[PDB]
């Protein structure tokens, strides 16, 4: 570089992507809009003479029927069309077999990073740990970094330690490329502080044990927050969208991650001078995103939709709009999901669903709010538009594992919701009188796992919450999904085997 010259560089970045390459009902976020905001960045940029690098934190794949029932296609080539520049690989494209995410990478006009993923035969990386490009005189490295929890398809796959696999890296690329800046895209997860607690350590452990600014920042994604400091090693809880953020920053080196599903496009804008990186400014831009005050109103300046990003995507929306009509399987009987018989007594749409989300978990038992079950599924075939019809809102499965002491107290609080609600509680594996996990006895001391939904696990409809404690896990499956997997893999259904025979009573 010119000794002595300031060059400006903008990183935009995006995570968690998860099929939502379409704006929802609201009208909000989407690619098409996203590609707007892009090229509008990159106009106002250029003009000045400075760089712009796009970067994803991974999870393109899983989370809308539209895209899993494509592979994601319209997703990566959507990403093509916003210009996408690297892309950390994350836990959920490990949700298909490789052969279709070899097949994702022949799609996707960028390079899908990731350095630490090992093929346990051979010994080999799977993916380029890394890419490098070119801004004016400088050589910028982007290094990629998959959480090792992923195995959670992996025969003779090895995920080995990030923060570990990173320093070798990092050394490879001094020794060899010299880069004048080294930026990380990487799919691990921002804790406060550092309080990973059950989840494997993610970027700030890993900044912390990396040396002093070795990495000019880390572009993340996995936990799926918008990482606003409201205090030292503290994320601010309900993040306002267009409201001040003030990015995370451990020894030297700056934490980001955009939240997920293309909500916000985030923006650091840097001044490289003599070696000497500094941010000279951050900000989370809002894609569309409206609040619900009733009516739901834009918080900032509406954006349009690309044309040309339109034109592309239409076809894969009605593509896969279409395919929901296509048939899943099949059940004798009628599983009841009416209101008026869900939020008062336990029902065998109750069981099939609880079923599912055990099975695709691994729990000992289950229990959801009946107000989240909203439809039935007459006999005969089940198409997934059917499904999505009792399961419409998209809420995720995700699991906790507890002490039996826990679950007492749990089943307690939760046995107290009241009937003629939509907080009433329908349970999977758990037999009472109110005034037994799987048929035993509940042994105090003893672990159990429970499924439900992210909703009630974050205190919906008043659950206690099991959101900040340990062995909680997001598993990122979609509550359609997993209900539509379960039936197509269970087919034909026998709604006998779905009764409740009674087992919970007052
Ligand atoms: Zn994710
Ligand atoms: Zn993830
Ligand atoms: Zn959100
Ligand atoms: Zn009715």
Redesign the pocket.
Known sequence: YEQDKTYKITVLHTNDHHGHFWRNEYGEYGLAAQKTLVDGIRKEVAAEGGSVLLLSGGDINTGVPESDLQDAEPDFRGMNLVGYDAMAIGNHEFDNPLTVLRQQEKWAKFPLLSANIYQKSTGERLFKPWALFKRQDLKIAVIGLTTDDTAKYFTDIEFRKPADEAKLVIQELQQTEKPDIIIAATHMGHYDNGEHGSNAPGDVEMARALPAGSLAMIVGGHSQDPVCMAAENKKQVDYVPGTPCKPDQQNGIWIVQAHEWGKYVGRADFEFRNGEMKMVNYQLIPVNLKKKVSERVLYTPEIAENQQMISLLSPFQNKGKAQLEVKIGETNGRLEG????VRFVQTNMGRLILAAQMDRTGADFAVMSGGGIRDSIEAGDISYKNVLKVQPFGNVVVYADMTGKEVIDYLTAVAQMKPDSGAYPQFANVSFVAKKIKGEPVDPAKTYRMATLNFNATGGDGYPRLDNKPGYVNTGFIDAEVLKAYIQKSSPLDVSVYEPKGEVSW
Do not use: G, P
């Open positions: 009416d209101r008026d018989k």
